[PDB]
């Protein structure tokens, strides 16, 4: 409701520089949040238990790092966002247009930790080839992609990072949004959920956005109540040097959940 | 190697003051059980939920590095008939002794007992819980987790134990990560194969006050804890993190969060 108007002033390039340029975007320190997120995803896909033909990324924003390890396990990938200015920034990177964001530091680091000898250009090439479409989405609607969408449903897997808690006024609408995106997932399919812990605001240029502050326990309970078995749930505590003025995040959680 | 760091630990703890330690961590604001987002309730919930699965039971339990605290055995004591408590410091073993004798001027744990009864959901009154705990504590022993035999040779303890509980001991007495790992291997010799270890500890902490004692700690992370448990021959069944909120980031320590691990020895 009120989240809708706040996001109308969201600046993609301000969000990217706040969260994916140095210091947070410096991947040289292995104790940083960037390396921790990439490791969570790489370790999960390296188990081999998360696989299929189609995958959907919920609330992509203007970022692609969350699919770097995913893309070699799913041949049809749908990226999504509420904002068209983000879908446009995504398109600029998928089509190698001018002004695209330079994700190569993240592709590089994903290649390092996967340990398959893959060069980073091949990783990026493969991600662009498998992202078939970039669609609008609204996780508040009981059909987040609308009716009859160009997206093959139900998907084998969902990935969502920093969306649900950032679009939800409180714990209850957070739980509904989770219920809503769960309708997109085949039984036995997997959810990879990344989110901020105990956060209440972040800035994106002129936009100041409200976040529901959630704990690890509340994330687990909410995944159960939506019908998931929780395969893994991990926490990163935000160090002082990554506490800038752009938000009040206290930590990051990673959940690997399987729909029963 | 590292015998110097361990000699530094032993030395620092000769100034550990039990009553001052209890005030800092088990009276309000840290010891306030009314705030359901506080760290006291979170720890009690972790232990109560783990014992309510029915999967952690047996005859004998050892509490590793109890200090002068009993809260970590409140939910455990209905599932184990023989409990061994332990600590490095005799002043702590006397403090426990004062509470076992029900003396006035022993620390009052009844807020913790009441909270344990509340969340266990069995309608138990806190005075029956405390009576059961006092009955089932069969001995209070010196321990040193840096020794290959942390209880010493030919200890009174019934070994091997069916379960281990340890709250805030290993990371608070180890100068480095290698020491932490060796101390875990040592206490794991006390646990039977297939037995369970319940581990509570501080995350990313480098010091705390035991009144006047300002003692240094090796900061550990969740992933370091998980890896140490695997390296010791455990399967990790649960590893939860509590992030220390600002309103309880008093001057008592620089702790950033708390971990709870449920591990089973293979
Ligand atoms: N070589 C050795 N071998 C074996 N045991 C040894 C050896 N050397 C010393 N010891 C024993 O180690 C015990 C450690 N203490 C306190 C440790 C620090 C806790 C503190 C840290 N800051 C964060 C924080 C804390 C507490 C609560 C909360 Cl919430 C938070 Cl956040 C016992 C703790 C008690 N079990 C309990 O649980 O409180 C002492 O008794 C000492 O004598
Ligand atoms: N109602 C809604 N439903 C789904 N997504 C929404 C939404 N309102 C805003 N969003 C999107 O949620 C995103 C949160 S920022 C998350 C960005 C990216 N996933 C990352 O990992 O950094 C923004 O792109 C915002 O446009």
UniProtKB/Swiss-Prot annotation, chain A:
Binding site for S-adenosyl-L-methionine: 15, 20, 59-60, 65, 81, 86, 138-139, 161
Catalytic activity: phenylethanolamine + S-adenosyl-L-methionine = N-methylphenylethanolamine + S-adenosyl-L-homocysteine + H(+); (R)-noradrenaline + S-adenosyl-L-methionine = (R)-adrenaline + S-adenosyl-L-homocysteine + H(+); (R)-normetanephrine + S-adenosyl-L-methionine = (R)-metanephrine + S-adenosyl-L-homocysteine + H(+); (R)-octopamine + S-adenosyl-L-methionine = (R)-synephrine + S-adenosyl-L-homocysteine + H(+)
Gene3D superfamilies the UniProt entry points to: Vaccinia Virus protein VP39
Alphabetical list of InterPro entries matching this protein: NNMT/PNMT/TEMT_CS (IPR025820), NNMT_TEMT_trans (IPR000940), SAM-dep_methyltransferase (IPR053384), SAM-dependent_MTases_sf (IPR029063)
Residues binding octopamine, per UniProt: 199, 247
Its job: Catalyzes the transmethylation of nonepinephrine (noradrenaline) to form epinephrine (adrenaline), using S-adenosyl-L-methionine as the methyl donor. Other substrates include phenylethanolamine and octopamine. Also methylates normetanephrine.
Its EC number(s): 2.1.1.28
Pfam families registered for this protein in UniProt: NNMT_PNMT_TEMT (PF01234)
GO cellular component terms attached to this protein's record: cytosol
Signal peptide: none
UniProt-recorded name of the protein: Phenylethanolamine N-methyltransferase
GO molecular function: phenylethanolamine N-methyltransferase activity
Gene name, Swiss-Prot/TrEMBL: PNMT
Effect seen on changing residue 165 to D: Strongly reduced enzyme activity towards phenylethanolamine. Decreases affinity for phenylethanolamine and S-adenosyl-L-methionine 3-fold
């Amino acid at each position: 409701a009120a989240v809708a108007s706040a996001y109308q002033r969201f600046e993609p390039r301000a969000y990217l520089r706040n969260n994916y340029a140095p210091p947070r975007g410096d991947l040289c320190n292995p104790n940083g949040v960037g390396p921790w997120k990439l490791r969570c995803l790489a370790q999960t896909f390296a188990t081999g238990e998360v696989s299929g033909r189609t995958l959907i990324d919920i609330g992509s924003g203007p970022t692609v790092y969350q699919l770097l390890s995913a893309c070699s396990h799913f041949e049809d990938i749908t990226m999504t966002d509420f904002l068209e200015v983000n879908r446009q920034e995504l398109g600029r990177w998928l089509q190698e247009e001018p002004g695209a964001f330079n994700w190569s530091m993240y592709s590089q680091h994903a290649c390092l930790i996967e340990g398959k000898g893959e060069c980073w250009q091949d990783k990026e090439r493969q991600l662009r080839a498998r992202v078939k479409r970039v669609l609008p989405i609204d996780v508040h609607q009981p059909q987040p992609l609308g009716a009859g969408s160009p997206a093959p449903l139900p998907a084998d897997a969902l990935v969502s990072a920093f969306c649900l808690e950032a679009v939800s006024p409180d714990l209850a609408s957070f739980q509904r949004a989770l219920d809503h995106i769960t309708t997109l997932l085949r039984p036995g399919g997997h959810l990879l959920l990344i989110g901020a812990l105990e956060e209440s605001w972040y800035l994106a240029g002129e936009a100041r956005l409200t976040v529901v502050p959630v704990s690890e326990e509340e994330v687990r309970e909410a995944l159960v109540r939506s019908g998931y078995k929780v395969r893994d749930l991990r926490t990163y505590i935000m160090p002082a040097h990554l506490q800038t003025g752009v938000d009040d995040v206290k930590g990051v959680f990673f959940a690997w959940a399987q729909k029963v």
